[PDB]
Scaffold this active site. Structure first.
Site, mmCIF file in Angstrom:
data_model
loop_
_atom_site.group_PDB
_atom_site.id
_atom_site.type_symbol
_atom_site.label_atom_id
_atom_site.label_comp_id
_atom_site.label_asym_id
_atom_site.label_seq_id
_atom_site.Cartn_x
_atom_site.Cartn_y
_atom_site.Cartn_z
ATOM 1 N N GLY A 1 34.734 6.024 155.402
ATOM 2 C CA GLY A 1 34.596 6.247 156.824
ATOM 3 C C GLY A 1 35.464 5.281 157.604
ATOM 4 O O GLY A 1 36.464 4.780 157.101
ATOM 5 N N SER B 1 36.126 3.980 149.214
ATOM 6 C CA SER B 1 36.820 3.487 150.407
ATOM 7 C C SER B 1 35.980 2.378 151.028
ATOM 8 O O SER B 1 35.675 1.397 150.327
ATOM 9 C CB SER B 1 37.124 4.676 151.320
ATOM 10 N N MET B 2 35.587 2.474 152.300
ATOM 11 C CA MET B 2 34.737 1.452 152.896
ATOM 12 C C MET B 2 33.378 1.371 152.217
ATOM 13 O O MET B 2 32.727 0.324 152.283
ATOM 14 C CB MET B 2 34.561 1.715 154.394
ATOM 15 N N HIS C 1 40.895 2.031 147.554
ATOM 16 C CA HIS C 1 42.226 2.480 147.942
ATOM 17 C C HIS C 1 42.594 1.846 149.273
ATOM 18 O O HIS C 1 41.728 1.414 150.038
ATOM 19 C CB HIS C 1 42.300 4.007 148.041
ATOM 20 N N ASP D 1 44.462 6.128 145.065
ATOM 21 C CA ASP D 1 43.032 6.220 144.787
ATOM 22 C C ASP D 1 42.718 5.759 143.373
ATOM 23 O O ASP D 1 43.155 6.370 142.394
ATOM 24 C CB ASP D 1 42.549 7.655 144.999
#
Ligand SMILES: Nc1ncnc2c1ncn2[C@@H]1O[C@H](COP(=O)(O)OP(=O)(O)OP(=O)(O)O)[C@@H](O)[C@H]1O
Ligand SMILES: Nc1ncnc2c1ncn2[C@@H]1O[C@H](COP(=O)(O)OP(=O)(O)OP(=O)(O)O)[C@@H](O)[C@H]1O
Ligand SMILES: [Mg+2]
Ligand SMILES: [Mg+2]
Lengths: 337, 190, 340, 192
Positions: free
Chosen positions: B65, B94-95, B119, B170
């Site tokens: 996000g 991610s986050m 990533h 990724d």
């Protein structure tokens, strides 16, 4: 001379199975009690104060039995009090001074011997204010008795009726409190085990491990005022009897259950014999009742019910054999004529 | 969705998420937005006040996000006195993987079949307008990229050069690979 | 003449370790009371109230020791009462007049000395007020004792049996009352008055620190505990006892005449075994006792459970001469070093 | 939809919606697609029920066409982690991750209704494969790892070889309750 703690325990091993820590604590306390009694009282010597005991154990673990067995080889006056009969000073019932009254009556009201006696107060957990905080109302049977015992457990002068009140010093009188603190396992578990919901949290018992780590904080949360716990420094814990101890309880002690029933059949002319697997099944079934060694009687009486009913009627019977199938299955024991 | 109602014995009726918040469990489920991140911050602040010493359990099942939204959670986790334990359920990407690695060292967990992906950030915002505006947004994205890699390298006890290689595209990791990498400390089984 | 506060506390240190503020408060109040009686020029408008003392503190903090040491030093009619024995006049037990009777007996029934003596009352927190009763015929042991006690603490005249088997009139205007007890609900009362806390980044967020809580007691907190307000108003001096720290517990463990260390060394002196403790052992014993939250009473439990596996064997071990208790015996499940 | 309200008799009365009432009986429903939100509700219910009673069985009723693999894995790991056995029951259908979670129930306690439909297959897109060929290679490798992980866990659940699940999940494999019992996905078929 004085009997060593090992001898005191050797007298307890005849009647009590297991609970080595509690027996060792009681033996050391009785030995130190004698040593205080013969220690010089005046001079440059330090005056030795007493270290009272609190027996904590589940139902049928051997608390009352430990006291009764200890009372056979004490050489000093001894009584078994009942905290459920105790009351506050101003209300009906027995006052805490009745404990001294019974200890005094045991020794022909010879105060010199009563002041050197040992007192076992049973059901000490039944006077615990379940509130954990100041009781909203007068707990005449509970918190009030704890408050009235503080001066009695410690050193004071008791005024009791004659055999004109009698003055008895309770400074050298050893007090052994005992009780089955039922809700104590939950308190110890909440304090130690990080219970909750989700991953990384404890989910729930092991009353033996929990009692082995009991602290005054748990007894305060259970309902014992801290002033009484501070006067009971020794906290001897009794373990829940395992499947291997319940088997030895059946045969080994002087007044074992199997021996009691062999004597009941000895009032007749019939021998009663158990098998090894039978004893193990009786112990494993009594374990599930959560009543301690008191459950062994419920199994031996259930399996021998029909046999004892027919025993006086059967003629020529000479021996009864209780097998493993008699316990795990509703069979009849082998009758030998 | 209909959130079930449960009864707490003390009776008090809770929805099942408020009941778990009572046990100091905070959920980050789905994308990290301003609104979902502020709920996490509100719960973290509330739980510190209830008990500043007890651990907070931060359950993460998120594909990622907003970086700024995730940073509001991140700074709240580091600020508040109680340790924030993190657990990866399903995925932390991610986050989500950043906040997973952001848990208290020694208390970062993942379930055995969870998937953890790290990533470099994508667009933190569009790059339109004039070349001067695009240069500014490109510079800000590069600063965020370096800040994330630097904080990730700190969480994982790795060199910044390692995170720069591994976050280039990724990077999917099993729970075991994330434990070896330094994103999590333990893998739960029972 | 009249022992001064410096002399009073200098001799309280011989029996009570720590609790310096309380020793100062008790000494100053007692000296002021006795001097006030010797110079009743305060008959002027200034109504110097009778400076009674309320002695609050945790269990094992030394309330009953301060009372006894103050008694045996002051050389004054002193009685130690227990509210657990007190009852309403019309029921079984000891009515509040038995305390005056004991005060007369302590002075050969010379009422002139009894009317200027001290009355210590332990466990006064046990007669607090409570809701209407389970155990309901009358709340005899509670508020009734408080009122009968208030009628004595304020200036009145009591009628008590004679010196032999004609009652004696005893005026208690000049009798000093020192009440004490471990108010177990007082920390919760105070923690409800304060401990507001807060939430947010810029707000301060936060076992009960009953030391500083007891240090900030207010009369209304004691009213909430169950004490009647007219009794607290008659107890203006409030002496608070801190929880004994590691150093005070160590001194209690070793220094006093009847310290635990000396008690067990003499307990082993009934045999021929020397008992020796290491400095780290005393430090760890004091720490573990402080963690039990029972005061100096939790010290005997530690020393008893650490020596249990040794006292069980001393009569059987022959040739033993010394036993050394180290820090490992207290902190770990170790056995003391046996020296044969 | 309007969820009916039911009244529980107790020691007084408590009004529940019918799903909270069934949760009180340790019944957790997975209905429709498996999403982050629907899977986290299942996880929240599984965690809650373990704390209420760690020893009593949890009944996981499944009527789902499938959904996200990561979402289904959050349920899967929660089922295996928590102490109480999670019994699974197939109502209507258990397809894709729904069939995986059905086979994930405690061995001996995996059930299906007589006319239920159980379908197993290799995963589809766990996410798009756009961008550059280097990005597409990465997502293809991750999908293959998920495919192998699912077949390996399915083979463990069914007491079959990994080679059997690789054949049978190649294309949509529809099974009756009897075929799923013979396969090893379920243990029993309920009738009454
Ligand atoms: N350790 C033991 N060894 C031998 N017999 C035992 C033991 N524990 C219990 N028993 C048997 O149980 C009977 C009663 O046990 P006891 O009264 O000692 O239990 P208790 O601890 O007093 O229980 P409660 O806490 O309920 O009073 C005795 O007659 C004895 O035969
Ligand atoms: N301040 C102290 N200095 C020296 N010894 C102490 C002190 N406090 C407690 N003790 C030790 O504790 C024992 C009993 O303490 P004491 O009876 O004075 O506590 P208490 O305040 O009366 O407790 P409670 O309020 O429960 O009655 C004494 O024998 C003494 O050796
Ligand atoms: Mg008993
Ligand atoms: Mg006292």
């Amino acid at each position: 001379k004085l009997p060593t703690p090992a001898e005191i325990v050797a007298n307890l091993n005849d009647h009590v199975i297991g609970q080595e820590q509690a027996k060792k604590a009681l033996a050391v306390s009785v030995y130190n009690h004698y040593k205080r009694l013969r220690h010089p009282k005046a001079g440059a010597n330090v005056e030795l104060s007493k270290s009272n005991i609190l027996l904590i154990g589940p139902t049928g673990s051997g608390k009352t039995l430990l006291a009764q067995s200890l009372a056979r080889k004490l050489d000093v006056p001894f009584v078994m009090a009942d905290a459920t009969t105790l009351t506050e000073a101003g209300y009906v019932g027995e006052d805490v001074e009745q404990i001294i009254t019974k200890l005094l009556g045991k020794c022909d009201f010879d105060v010199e011997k009563a002041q050197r006696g040992i007192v076992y107060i049973d059901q000490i957990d039944k006077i615990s204010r379940k509130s954990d905080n100041p009781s909203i109302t007068r707990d005449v049977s509970g918190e009030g008795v704890q408050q009235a015992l503080l001066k009695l457990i410690e050193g004071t002068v008791a005024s009791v009726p004659p055999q004109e009140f009698i003055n008895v010093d309770t400074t050298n009188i050893l007090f052994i409190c005992g009780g089955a603190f039922a809700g104590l396992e939950k308190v110890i578990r909440q304090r130690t085990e990080k219970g909750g919901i989700g991953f990384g949290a404890s989910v729930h018992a092991d009353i033996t491990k929990l009692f082995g780590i009991v602290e005054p904080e748990d007894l305060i949360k259970f309902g014992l005022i801290p002033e009484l716990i501070g006067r009971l420094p020794v906290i001897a814990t009794l373990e829940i009897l395992d499947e291997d101890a319940l088997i030895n309880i059946l045969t080994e002690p002087k007044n074992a259950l199997v021996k009691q029933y062999q004597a009941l059949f000895g009032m007749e002319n019939v021998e009663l014999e158990f098998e090894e697997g039978a004893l193990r099944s009786i112990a494993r079934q009594a374990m599930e009742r959560k009543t301690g060694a008191r459950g062994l009687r419920s199994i031996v009486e259930r399996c021998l019910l029909d046999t004892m009913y027919r025993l006086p009627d059967l003629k020529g019977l000479k021996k009864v054999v209780v097998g493993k199938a008699v316990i795990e299955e509703g069979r009849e024991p082998e009758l030998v004529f | 969705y209909l959130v079930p109602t449960v009864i707490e014995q003390s009776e008090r009726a809770f929805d099942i998420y408020s009941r778990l918040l009572k046990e100091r469990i905070v959920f980050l489920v789905g994308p990290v937005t301003d609104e979902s991140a502020n709920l996490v911050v509100a719960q973290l602040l509330f739980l510190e006040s209830e008990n500043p010493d007890k651990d907070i359990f931060f359950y993460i099942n998120s594909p990622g996000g907003s970086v700024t939204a995730g940073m509001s959670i991140y700074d709240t986790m580091n600020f508040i006195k109680p340790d924030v334990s993190t657990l990866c359920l399903g995925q932390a990407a991610s986050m989500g993987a950043f906040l997973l690695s952001a848990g208290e060292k020694g208390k970062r967990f993942a379930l055995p079949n969870s998937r953890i992906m790290i990533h470099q950030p994508l667009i933190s915002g569009g790059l339109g307008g004039q070349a001067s505006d695009i240069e500014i947004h490109a510079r800000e994205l590069l600063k965020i990229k370096e800040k994330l890699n630097r904080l990730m390298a700190k969480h994982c006890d790795r060199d910044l050069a390692d995170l720069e290689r591994d976050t280039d595209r990724d990077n999917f990791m099993s729970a075991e690979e994330a434990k070896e990498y330094g994103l999590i400390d333990q893998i739960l089984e029972n």
